[PDB]
Amino acid sequence: TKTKIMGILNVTNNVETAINRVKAMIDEGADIIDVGGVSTRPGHEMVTLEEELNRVLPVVEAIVGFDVKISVDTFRSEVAEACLKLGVDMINDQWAGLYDHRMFQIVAKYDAEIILMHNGNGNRDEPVVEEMLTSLLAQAHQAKIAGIPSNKIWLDPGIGFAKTRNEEAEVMARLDELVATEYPVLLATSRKRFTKEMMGYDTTPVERDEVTAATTAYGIMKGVRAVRVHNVELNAKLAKGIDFLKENENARH
Amino acid sequence: TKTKIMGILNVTNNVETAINRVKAMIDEGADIIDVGGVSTRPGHEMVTLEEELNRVLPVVEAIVGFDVKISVDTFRSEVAEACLKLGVDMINDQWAGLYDHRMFQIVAKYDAEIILMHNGNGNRDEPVVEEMLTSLLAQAHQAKIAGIPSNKIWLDPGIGFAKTRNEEAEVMARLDELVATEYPVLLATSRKRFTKEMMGYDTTPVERDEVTAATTAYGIMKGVRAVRVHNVELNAKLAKGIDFLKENENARH
C-alpha cells in the first residue's frame, strides 16, 4: 500500500478558509488531514477544553464529509468523542493516552484509529530508544485491552518532544526498530528543530521543506507508513516516487 | 563524503547565457556542470567534429574558471582533448570509449576522470544487468590499462538508452549491484521516460522533478556517488538531507 500523506490543518470565515485548505490538500495528494487546536510543546498556549471544542468542532463538522481521512490531534477524550460522533477516522494523541485514560475506550467505541506519540518532560532512566519503545508498546497494549485492533494503532516517535538533539539523532538513526513493532509508524518531522539541524545554518520554516522531504524518503525506506507534513504536494510526489521504486525493487527480487 | 550534484548545461548570446546559467547552478549547489552539445539517442541529431567544437569550446573557456568542476559530455577524443588542455575535470562518454578508443589515453594523459555510460542498440544476448556489467567492467578495465585510477572511473547505467521499459526497471531495481563494483556510480534519470512512468499520468518534463528527486534519494541510499539533474536546487537540498541521515545512521551504529 501507498505511504499515506498526512497534511497539517491548524485551527488555532475560519470554517470557510479551512474547507478551502482541505480541498487544496486533497488536490495536492493528502490521504489524511490532521486537525488540531492544541500543543503539548513546552510554552504552548493554554487552551481549555471548552476553547478546544469551540475551535475544532465547527471545522471538523464542515470537512468530515470529504473523501479524505480526518485525524483530530487531541489528548482529551471529550474532544475525541465529539469528533468521533461527527465521523472522524483517527485520533492523534500527543500523550499516547496518558493524559486521559478514557481515550482508549472512546476510540474503541467508535472503531476508529489512534496514533500514540512519544512524549514526556525529557527525564528518563533508560536510553531514549529503549524508553520510547517500552512506553509506546505498553500504551499500545492498553489500547488493545480496550478493544482497538493492532492494525488501527499507530506509533509516532515524537520528534520535537521530550528529547535532546542527541536523542532525536539516535531515534532518527534507528527508525527500523520502531517499524519492527509492526504497528504502523507515522513520521512527523516537518520543519521542526531536527530539520533545522539538517540544514546546518539559519532557515525559515518553509526553507526546511526539502530536508523534510528527505526525511520522508528515508523514512519510507525504513518502512514508516505515513508522514505528517506541511508541504503536501512535495512530499506526496516524493513518496509516490519512493513507493514506486520500492515496489519495483520488491517485484524484481 | 557528500553525494555530488551534477547540473546539466546543454548547448545549441549563447556564451553569456551559459555563463549566467552556470552561475545560477553553482548558487543552487552544483558540484559539477555537465556540458554537452551532442546526443547519442536514435531520436537525436548528427553533429560533426568541427560543429561540436564550435559549440562546446567557447562555453567551456568561459566557465572552466568558476568554482565548480566541469564535465564534458562527448564521445570524441579530439573534443575531450581540447577541453582537457583548457582544464576540465571529467569526460562523460555516452559510448564508454567504444566510439573512440583513444579516449582512455587522452583522459589518462591529463590526469582526469572518465564516466562510462551503458549504451547500445537495444540488442543483447544476455539479460540487461549482466550485459551492462560485462560491457562496463570491460570498458573500465581498458581505462585501468591506460593509467586511469579506479577511483576516477565512473559508471552510469544509462537510463534513457539501449533499454526497453522493463529493462530500465530491472536496472533501477538492482543499482546495488552496480555500486558493488566499487567504481563510483553516476545516476542520470532526470525527466526521462523512467520518471514519466513514475508519475504515470500525463506530465511535462518539468513536472517530473519531484520523482527525479525520489530517484536521487533512493540512489544515494543504494550508494550512488553523484546524480545528474536538471533541477539542481531541489536535488542538492534533498541529497544534503539524505547524506545527513545516512551519516547519522552510520555514526550511531
Curated annotation (Swiss-Prot), chains A, B:
One of its GO terms (biological process) is folic acid biosynthetic process. Residues 1-240 form the Pterin-binding domain. The keyword Lyase does not apply. Its EC number is 2.5.1.15. Its cofactor is Mg(2+). Pfam families: Pterin_bind (PF00809). One of its GO terms (cellular component) is cytosol. Mg(2+) binds at residue 10. Pathway: Cofactor biosynthesis; tetrahydrofolate biosynthesis; 7,8-dihydrofolate from 2-amino-4-hydroxy-6-hydroxymethyl-7,8-dihydropteridine diphosphate and 4-aminobenzoate: step 1/2. It catalyses: (7,8-dihydropterin-6-yl)methyl diphosphate + 4-aminobenzoate = 7,8-dihydropteroate + diphosphate. (7,8-dihydropterin-6-yl)methyl diphosphate binds at residues 40, 73, 92, 156, 192, 228-230. GO terms for molecular function: dihydropteroate synthase activity; metal ion binding. Belongs to the DHPS family. Homodimer. Catalyzes the condensation of para-aminobenzoate (pABA) with 6-hydroxymethyl-7,8-dihydropterin diphosphate (DHPt-PP) to form 7,8-dihydropteroate (H2Pte), the immediate precursor of folate derivatives. This is Dihydropteroate synthase. It comes from Staphylococcus aureus (strain Mu50 / ATCC 700699).
